[PDB]
Amino acid sequence: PRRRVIGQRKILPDPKFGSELLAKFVNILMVDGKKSTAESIVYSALETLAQRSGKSELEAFEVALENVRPTVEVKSRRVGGSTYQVPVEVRPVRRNALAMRWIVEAARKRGDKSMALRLANELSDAAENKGTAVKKREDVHRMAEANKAFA
Amino acid sequence: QDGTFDKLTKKEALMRTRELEKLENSLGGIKDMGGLPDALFVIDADHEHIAIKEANNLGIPVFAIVDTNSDPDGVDFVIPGNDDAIRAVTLYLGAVAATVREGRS
Amino acid sequence: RIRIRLKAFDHRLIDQATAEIVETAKRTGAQVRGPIPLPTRKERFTVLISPHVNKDARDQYEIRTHLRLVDIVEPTEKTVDALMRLDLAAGVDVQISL
Amino acid sequence: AKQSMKAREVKRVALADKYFAKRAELKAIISDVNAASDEDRWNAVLKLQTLPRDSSPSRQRNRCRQTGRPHGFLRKFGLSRIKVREAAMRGEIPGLKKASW
Amino acid sequence: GQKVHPNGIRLGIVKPWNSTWFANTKEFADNLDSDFKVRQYLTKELAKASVSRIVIERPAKSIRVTIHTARPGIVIGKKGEDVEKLRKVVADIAGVPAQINIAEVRKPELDAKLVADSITSQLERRVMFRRAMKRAVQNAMRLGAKGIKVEVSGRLGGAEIARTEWYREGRVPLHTLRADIDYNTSEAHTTYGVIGVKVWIFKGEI
Amino acid sequence: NQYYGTGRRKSSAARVFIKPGNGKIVINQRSLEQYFGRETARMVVRQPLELVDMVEKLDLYITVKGGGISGQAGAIRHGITRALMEYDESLRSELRKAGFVTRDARQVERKKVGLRKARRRPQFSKR
RNA sequence: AAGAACCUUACCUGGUCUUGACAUCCACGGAAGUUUUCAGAGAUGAGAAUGUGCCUUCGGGAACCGUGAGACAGGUGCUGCAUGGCUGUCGUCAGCUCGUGUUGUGAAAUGUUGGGUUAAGUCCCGCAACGAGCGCAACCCUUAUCCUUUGUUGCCAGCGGUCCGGCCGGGAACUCAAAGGAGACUGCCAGUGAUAAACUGGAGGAAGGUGGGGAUGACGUCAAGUCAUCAUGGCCCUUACGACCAGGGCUACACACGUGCUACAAUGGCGCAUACAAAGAGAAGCGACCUCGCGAGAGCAAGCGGACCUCAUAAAGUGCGUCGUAGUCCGGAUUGGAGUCUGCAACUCGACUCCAUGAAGUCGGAAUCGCUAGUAAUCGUGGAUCAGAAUGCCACGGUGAAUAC
Lengths: 151, 105, 98, 101, 206, 127
Ligand SMILES: [Mg+2]
Known about the structure:
- Chain B: This is Small ribosomal subunit protein uS2.
- Chain B: It comes from Escherichia coli.
- The structure is cut from a larger assembly and holds chains A (about 150 residues), B (about 100 residues), C (about 100 residues), D (about 100 residues), E (about 210 residues) and F (about 130 residues).
- Chain C is of the alpha+beta class and about 100 residues long.
- Chain C has helices at about 10-25, 75-80; strands at about 5-10, 40-50, 60-70, 90-95.
- Chain C has one domain: Alpha-Beta Plaits.
- The longest helix of chain C is centred in the first third of the chain and has 16 residues, at about 10-25.
- Chain C is elongated.
- The N and C termini of chain F lie far apart (about 70 Å).
- Chain F is built from 3 helices and 5 strands; from the N terminus they run ββββαβαα.
- The chains are: A mainly alpha (about 150), B mainly alpha (about 100), C alpha+beta (about 100), D mainly alpha (about 100), E alpha/beta (about 210), F alpha+beta (about 130).
- The interface of D and E includes residues 87, 88, 93, 95 and 98 of D.
- Chain D binds one RNA strand of 405 nucleotides through α1, α4 and β1.
């Protein structure tokens, strides 16, 4: 806020093998507050991706995420007059969260059979960098690298 | 000092100690006055302008020691001398103390 | 045997009412069980503080009803009548059941 | 507050407790699934018009006892919200203080 | 009209209840109506006798009315006639034999209702509102009180517009709950309209 | 012999008796796998049992009432942590540097008057 | 408006009543009261049988009812621009002021500004200011941990036997339970800061710095809303604008807007088996159990003015099988017959279950609102209003996030 310089909250670790990043991923999968179902879908997609690619649950996610992990984002910071965009480096705590958010947003669409299948296919696609979250990453990088004159 | 100093709260006891220290080092010397003063021996007239400005508003002599940068207008008996050097003030003030105390004869 | 159930509104009155009604029956009618808590009944109410529009402004009141059981075990002669015709310390509804 | 309506309501109460609550068997016991399925129940519902349009408990509006207000009524105290708040803040109702939790 | 009742907010902390009786939800309303009726009749009857508050208890189906006043002689009359007169004209409506009990206070200038009655009675004699308010506050403060605040509102002075004027003397914290604060309002019907007079008397801090 | 912890979390209230023996958990005449071990948050009771192992030290006779699944499970966790008193602060100094001792009341706020669910205003609109 | 079928009702049509429906006085005649018939939309008129005490001033009394005049009653009629009281808003924003002193011819100023800190003219420091009041904070309630009394219609770990229902003996350890206390108060340490206030971090501790939430609403503004809740100044009707009643309307619909619910579906619909709540209501009411129907409900009928009895089966959630992205088993609007429940009466104008129907709707333009924590989001439960009638209001509980550069 304006005066409160408080930091982030300490979320609960994952009930499966200890991991905070996929716990945050599960937390951003949940609608109507149904966490059990979100965990079930996440575990289903993780197993479906690990068995299909050969890697395990924790390693597989990492490869996929870094392919959708953005570099810089554009945001409006007007300085006495014109209102222009300012591409800038985003913090890592927001960078990984935004990568996972784009993953879940791409998975919300592209309905194959179910949510778990959707998300496993999206993770496999980000693994080789030809999905929709990677397309969003490239759209952001195109918004950047073009308006870089403002720095 | 003897009655209520550890009854309500330690924080409030410290509060009252601070209040007493402030009130005493501010208005501790004029505590047992009881009435109006008769003479105001002042060490400066340029720095402590308002002291003389207040003492001259009524019938009280405000003879004081003034340096070159002060106004010897409202003072009754100007005393030319130094105001900052400790030695100078102590000589003048020792004379003052001797003259006032043997005046108690 | 004697089921004494007393209920009132103010606790700092009902408690001493129970104390007197218990010591005026144990000093001569001992083997009593004491002031059982019998949790309170809270009747709440939410009214409008205005006679007109501005519904959003409401007042919230409540009445507490504190209950207590004494639960005397033996129907003694020092008890049965010593409970009766001693109905002072009003403001407390007392009910004795055999 | 329409003393006309208040007198009308007390008249309703009197006439209702006078007729009904004593002769309610004409509609509670006779209108039964029994051998009374014949013209007996027909004559029962016929005489059910013997009593005036009033006398029924549903025409009891239960207005306030101090003012006679139809809305904002509480069956616990018998008063409207305005007067119950006034009395509660003045200290007339026992045990009724401001609730906070 | 944006503040809370100083008595209602302290009904449980400091100030007690006026009616102290227990009844169940079947006869609660009947009991409250009987209390209101006896209260209004007793006030309409003893208006000229200074009663500040009337505590209404009911020990064992027997109503008990403790009348806190300042002039008990005018209340009881010689030989006590008026007390039993009140008992009869009260039990005629209460439904049970009533035990009424007078209680005088030797400091009538510190009661909210008594001060409001004085101000209303002085206003109804064409007295200057400023003079009345100042005299009442000075009397209270010289009789003993840690704080007072009077407020009059209406057509005071016979004006066409209404202006609310309040006068305070001392410390009168309304947000402090442990404080003993007497509050009560009086109406005054003059030849020009209604005038409301409320009083906050900070009798003590605890 | 047998030690006790109370435990309570979000309208729950537990009673955890702890005894040296098997590593089983008997909760309300039901086992841990069939009580809530099939739903998510399956090991919210086993979390404070790896820093100090449970597989072959002791078992727990548990009761719990009030609240929901996760509430009762957190109450069981807190009751276990409070019952670990025959192994007192000597182990709590480590149990506390990871949680498992914060009561964490954070009860549900009361619904406010004029509001909808104690924070959701009733859809303000200008005109 | 915490709940329009009649009632409520203050509106309209129609029929009536008139010192009047509601209140007091005089005089006259009759106990009051009760049953019942005729005409009517009913208000009402005309009647027919009954009943006669409470004390004797006893030319009757203490009530009740029938009638005549006058004082009067009545008005939800107007005036919130005559008012009281109450309420909203700026705004729980941190400000609004006074005494004395001082400056200024004076209106006024200082105090209340200035360096820091805080949620806060909170605090400290400086300073012609020294103090104080209303404000802030604290005092109040609840929750969070623990200690003490009692241990029931509450509980039951350690024991006795079990139709393993704490059902029964047995206990005051444990949960819960109503009281009285402890604690959390910048309490200690390190750094920074003008060695001040204070900030950051740490140890103990359930809780760190106003722990979480609530009530508490400053001088005053809007010449704000209410004389339709209530009281009242004045204007008016007072054979009427007062009063009673049958029906209708407040539910009308070419349209526009606000507030919510239902959804638009696969983290989901449907059928089956399963587990976990809090808070409350109850007697001309809640209403076990048993019988009937697919059903709403009906008949008999225990317990309960209550930690025992009822409301009352908690749902999301978990597993199984189906549905393959289709306007589809999502969706449930509207429609015809029949039925159940309240009520004197359910057409105008109630709710409920079933039979058939299935719409628009495939995530929503400009624009715009709420929320920083158990909050949002989502799911269910209870209560006031009430004969019946909520998707609204109030309250409770389950799962439970993201972000704050
Ligand atoms: Mg200021």
